[PDB]
């Protein structure tokens, strides 16, 4: 079909690789493809160099290598394995006395490998490591909140790599240093570095009143040894001040690169702030037997200069993105790697004492368990390690680009106020101002902007075009926020003829402040409007017409869109939807130019230029983390000539290579009989008839058979007391057959368990005796379909013990997995949304004859209430509908870029050409204006919509240019009294579906200690009737309703039993008894040595334990 694209802005560079923030970070961390001699000291390599040599015999690090993965990715997901590589290190043990050297390559366990798309496979499940924003290491000067004319100097290193130091000028006038919560006069620390009054007086004298607060006679009297011992006694009271002990502690606090690490970014920021050059990442050095200063004197000089008001000295904005940096996958993982390595080193030193001091190898010295555990802990249990969101391809791409201020080494949610959550001016071009969570995490979880990239230091940079004279170059410079602040940057839409700025006054930013400026003053210019927003936000057409609060929901909800069997790309696109599919890695493309040899549902064979025959297998109906079906479909035919980068297969949610999150439906904006009320949505049954909004879902079920002290669990078709009706669809072995339809209550995998030893009650003795049937030894433990679930069985995996290639966890004889698939039609309670933040649940499905319809007989698909628009201020959905109407009749789709889009005149032009197709056709077919069309026209000229005196055709065209048409009520045949807005809208079916959420319980499982119902649908849980619900019952004065909630419907054991028995017998429910959790409370207070006594009116004890707990 035709695709007409609007907008004149030419973007000189394409979007960067969208997952590069993940992929490149990890590549740098492993340095796997670099030959060892060529490795830089970074990532894993830097961790080894930091941990070694291990001194005590001396064990030294030579080099590491990474092997190949024991199993490929597909296999790991199948077998619940982690995709990982064996890590080895060549280590040499040396005896410094003897000279003896034994060298060996020790196996350190495995390290997880990142897949092509930037994710991990950890125990079979796909995971994402979310980048973490935090304070850049460095030296900052912030204002002291208590004392206005004073400031605090904070020296910050990398996390866990050293203490923070705070410099303050106390009211008494002496300059104090705060380390690990202890304060002392800084003069003492200066003396340890070897500074003398002569050097300090001349250096800081320029600032009058402050230098005297630094002068302390007693400190200068003592030599560097006495000052160092004095400081150690101040910092570590009670620890004997052995001279070697003090040097060791202070060295570790200041000069040790192993215990103190400023960043590489920390070093640059300090050097840049204080105007010096650092020999390393430490605040000082240990050289020639003494300590030699690096940092302290320059920060002190700047600190005094700030207090005195010397020109050129500023306080630092700590939310500026120059002072805030990103810790990506490589850095986070390497940190945990460094931790595991330190633990392993502890074991080495401990092993270097015991055993024989003579015969020892590196293999005998190293226990790798601490390292394996540190890495295993990071990937499974870290907060930044998240279950991948792969609801649709855009979901995971977005997940990889998210930025969190939470996690280890970061903000808590209550401790995070407005400042961090704010959109800083420096977020421009770096962090999307739109895409952030609604609710408690707002401003804490953010998203990388589309053109943004994280530099080697960890700062987010954004591209700008150089502007020389009035000429805009094509050379793009990626800038940090700090460097961006130097220039005057014109907006990307400023008019150009050729490379020249064509306006007399241009719109630019200087340090974020908007200003009108001459082309002579323009140093750079934005690459595109796309650079201000995230990828999801960049997918919203007419975004300039939507209030940001709704665009937020629009961005976020594209993440929740379900892949549809009929999915289509929107008729109004933004031009990013092709790139998103390509970077997502869902779609399949041709490597080189070639011709297609074979095309199957399962595979595509391509013959390239090289002559080599390449076969691409297709992933068919695979279950994602969220259970949506990932399946690839061949888009080419046998004998087709393809070029390099031509589409071979569509992934999920893509149509011919374009991102397809939904369907294009015909919408009428109008109230409908209250089924539209308060965001509810009315849809036509035609949508189900033609399988729009239908999605495939797969659920995985699992069961283990294990050894017991009572005998084996067995997976079997022989299950006590079950009819052949019940076993019909089970195979010989007891597993449900592929292709069977399973419904709630149905057996998936049959299983028997040996009955726990019990004496049958005398009732069972008599019952067994009456019927003459031996009580079986085993019980029916079979796995069944839970309430509300079921579908068609598409797969079964069975793994026994003692069969080739498989070993289970101890005690487990066999494991069975049953994959059940369901084709889900859209239904009442399902949630729909568009890209502008319009969201609603389907409240009514009308038959086609009730649907409002056009004069030519076409019923609309969806009816959206206009009451949702004005308060929300998202008008983009309206413009999308208007342009969607033109495209419906012209048979075309559009690309309207964000902020450089189709404007109203152009949309009107298309609407005019469309009206010719919608109407001119009719006049030739021999039909004139309808009577009811005249009536609608009458009310319309009363509304000022049409010009009086024009022909009926002319007036209908005037309305059509306003995007309104005459609409017939399918119930009556009479028109809607006014012309109504109708058009094509792009609407998605979100992941929140009633089938998943509907739940009810009569009685069910109870908790161990409290005896209260369990929680959640998966546990067959009860609803929580919480503190606030109780208040409601209290305010109503419903005492008996409330008492039921508190006793018979919860933890009153005697009461709940009696209530059930009464209801099945038709009696009224009995009076409640004591709730079991009150008995727990009494006993818990007795465990605390408090005697809690229930008393009667005579103040005599009442026993709520009924004699059972008293001797």
């Amino acid at each position: 079909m035709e695709i007409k694209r609007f907008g004149r802005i030419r973007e000189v560079i394409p979007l960067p690789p969208l997952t590069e923030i993940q992929v490149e970070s990890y590549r740098r961390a492993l340095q796997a493809d670099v030959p060892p001699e060529k490795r830089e000291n970074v990532g894993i390599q830097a961790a080894f160099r930091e941990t070694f040599p291990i001194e005590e015999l001396v064990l030294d690090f030579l080099e590491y290598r990474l092997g190949e993965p024991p199993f490929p990715q597909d296999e790991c997901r199948e077998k619940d394995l982690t995709y990982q590589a064996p890590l080895y290190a060549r280590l040499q043990l040396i005896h410094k006395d003897t000279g003896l050297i034994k060298e060996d390559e020790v196996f350190l366990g495995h390290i997880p490998l990142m897949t092509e798309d930037g994710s991990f496979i950890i125990n079979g499940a796909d995971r994402v490591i979310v980048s973490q924003i935090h304070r850049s290491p460095g030296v900052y000067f912030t204002p002291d909140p208590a004392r206005p004319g004073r400031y605090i100097a904070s020296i910050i290193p990398l996390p866990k790599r050293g203490p923070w130091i705070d410099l303050e000028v106390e009211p008494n006038g002496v300059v104090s240093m705060k380390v690990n919560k202890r304060k002392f006069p800084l003069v003492l620390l200066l003396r340890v570095l070897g500074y003398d009054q002569e050097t300090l007086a001349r250096e800081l004298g320029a600032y009058g009143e402050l230098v005297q607060g630094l002068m302390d006679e007693s400190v200068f009297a003592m030599r560097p040894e006495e000052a160092l011992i004095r400081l150690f006694t101040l910092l570590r009271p009670g620890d004997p001040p052995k001279r070697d002990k003090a040097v060791a502690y202070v060295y570790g606090l200041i000069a040790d690169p192993r215990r103190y690490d400023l960043g590489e970014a920390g070093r640059y920021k300090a050097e840049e702030k204080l105007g010096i050059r650092l020999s390393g990442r430490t605040l000082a050095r240990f050289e020639d037997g003494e300590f030699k200063d690096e940092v302290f004197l320059p920060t002190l000089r700047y600190l005094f200069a700030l207090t005195a008001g010397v020109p050129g000295h500023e306080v630092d904005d700590i939310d500026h993105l120059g002072n805030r940096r990103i810790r990506t996958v490589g850095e986070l993982m390497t940190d945990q790697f460094r931790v595991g390595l330190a633990r392993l080193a502890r074991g080495v030193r401990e092993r270097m004492l015991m055993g024989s001091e003579d015969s020892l190898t590196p293999a005998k010295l190293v226990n790798s368990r601490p390292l394996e555990a540190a890495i295993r802990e990071f990937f499974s249990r870290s907060q930044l390690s998240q279950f991948k969101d792969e609801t649709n391809p855009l979901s995971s791409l977005r997940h990889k680009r998210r930025i969190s201020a939470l996690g280890p080494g970061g903000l808590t949610r209550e401790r995070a106020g407005f400042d961090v959550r704010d959109v800083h001016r420096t977020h421009y071009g770096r962090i999307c101002p739109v895409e952030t969570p609604e609710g408690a995490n707002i401003g804490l979880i953010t998203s990388l902007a589309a053109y943004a990239r994280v530099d080697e230091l960890g700062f987010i940079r954004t591209p700008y075009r150089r502007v020389v004279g009035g000429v805009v170059t094509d050379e793009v410079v990626y800038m940090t926020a700090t460097e961006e602040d130097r220039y005057t940057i014109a907006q990307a839409n400023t008019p150009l003829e050729g490379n020249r700025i064509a306006a007399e006054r241009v719109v630019a930013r200087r340090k974020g402040e908007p200003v009108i400026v001459s082309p002579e003053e323009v140093e750079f210019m934005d690459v595109s409007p796309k650079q201000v927003f995230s990828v999801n936000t960049n997918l919203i057409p007419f975004l300039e017409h939507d209030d940001a609060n709704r665009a937020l929901m629009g961005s976020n909800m594209q993440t929740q869109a379900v892949p549809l069997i009929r999915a289509q790309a929107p008729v109004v696109m933004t031009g990013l939807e092709e790139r998103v599919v390509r970077d997502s890695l869902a779609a399949l493309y041709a490597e080189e130019d070639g011709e297609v040899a074979k095309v199957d549902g399962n595979r595509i064979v391509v013959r390239y230029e090289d002559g080599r025959l390449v076969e691409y297998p297709l992933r068919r109906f695979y279950r994602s983390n969220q259970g949506t079906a990932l399946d690839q479909r061949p888009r080419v035919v046998v004998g087709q000539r393809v070029r390099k980068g031509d589409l071979l297969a569509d992934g999920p949610a893509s149509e011919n290579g374009f991102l397809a999150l939904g369907q294009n439906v015909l919408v009428a904006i109008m109230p409908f009989d209250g089924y539209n009320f308060e965001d509810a949505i009315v849809i036509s049954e035609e949508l189900l008839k033609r399988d729009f909004y239908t999605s495939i879902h797969i659920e995985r079920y699992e069961i283990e058979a294990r050894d017991t002290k009572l005998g084996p669990e067995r997976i079997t078709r022989d299950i006590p007391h079950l009819s052949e009706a019940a076993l019909r669809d089970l195979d010989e072995e007891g597993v449900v057959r592929i292709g069977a339809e399973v419904k709630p209550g149905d057996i998936l995998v049959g299983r028997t368990s040996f009955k726990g030893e019990s004496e049958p009650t005398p009732e069972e003795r008599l019952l067994r005796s009456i019927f003459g049937e031996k009580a079986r030894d085993v019980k029916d433990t079979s796995l069944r379909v839970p309430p509300g679930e079921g579908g068609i069985v598409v797969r079964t995996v069975r793994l026994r013990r003692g069969d080739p290639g498989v070993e289970l966890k101890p005690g487990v004889r066999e494991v069975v997995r049953v994959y059940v698939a369901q084709k889900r039609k859209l239904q009442v309670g399902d949630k729909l949304a568009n890209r502008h933040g319009n969201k609603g649940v389907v409240a009514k499905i009308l038959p086609v004859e009730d649907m409002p319809h056009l004069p030519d007989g076409t019923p609309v698909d969806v009816i959206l209430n206009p009451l949702g628009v004005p308060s929300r201020m998202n008008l983009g959905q309206i413009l999308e509908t208007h342009l969607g109407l033109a495209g419906y009749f012209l048979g075309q789709r559009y690309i309207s870029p964000i902020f450089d889009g189709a404007k109203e005149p152009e949309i009107k032009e298309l609407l005019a050409q469309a009206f010719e197709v919608y109407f001119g056709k009719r006049k030739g077919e021999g039909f004139g204006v309808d009577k009811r069309e005249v009536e609608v026209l009458r009310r319309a000229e009363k509304l000022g919509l049409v010009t009086p005196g024009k022909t009926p055709e002319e007036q209908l065209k005037e309305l059509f240019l306003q995007g309104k048409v005459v609409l017939y009520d399918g119930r009556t045949g009479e028109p809607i009294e006014g012309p109504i807005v109708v058009g094509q809208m792009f609407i998605m079916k979100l992941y929140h579906m009633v089938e998943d959420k509907m739940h009810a319980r009569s009685t069910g499982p109870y908790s161990l200690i409290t005896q209260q119902p369990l929680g959640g649908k998966a546990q067959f849980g009860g609803q929580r009737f919480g503190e606030m619900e109780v208040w409601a019952l209290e305010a109503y004065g419903a005492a008996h309703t409330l008492q039921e909630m508190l006793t018979l419907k919860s933890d009153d054991i005697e009461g709940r039993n009696a209530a059930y028995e009464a209801i099945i017998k038709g009696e009224d429910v009995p009076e409640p008894s004591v709730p079991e959790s009150f008995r727990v409370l009494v006993k818990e207070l007795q465990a605390l040595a408090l005697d809690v006594q229930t008393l009667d009116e005579k103040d005599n004890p009442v026993d709520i334990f009924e004699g059972l707990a008293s001797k």
Binding site: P86, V106, S368, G811, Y1006, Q1011, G1015, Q1019
Partner: protein, 85 residues
């Protein structure tokens, strides 16, 4: 050290099995199977006994183990009570 107390000699056997498995993983470049551990342990050891020994050596896990990234739920809250009718 163990919530479920184990006889000192049995702890010795468990620890030997650990060292052995660690040797095998250090020479084999991957975790050993039950059978590989059984060879390394010598006569008297088959794969079944290695598994049974590992089963006996399993330590309990806390009922107060967190579920989720909020502090709001415990592992024990999801465990039904099979004792009371």
């Amino acid at each position: 050290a163990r919530t479920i107390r184990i006889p000192v000699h049995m702890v010795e056997t468990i620890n030997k099995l650990s060292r052995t498995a660690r040797q095998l993983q250090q020479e084999l470049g991957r975790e050993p199977t039950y059978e590989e551990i059984a060879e390394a342990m010598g006569p008297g050891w088959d794969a079944k006994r290695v598994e049974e020994t590992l089963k006996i050596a399993q330590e309990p896990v806390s009922l107060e183990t967190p579920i989720g990234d909020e502090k709001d739920s415990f592992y024990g809250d999801f465990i039904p009570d099979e004792h009371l009718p």
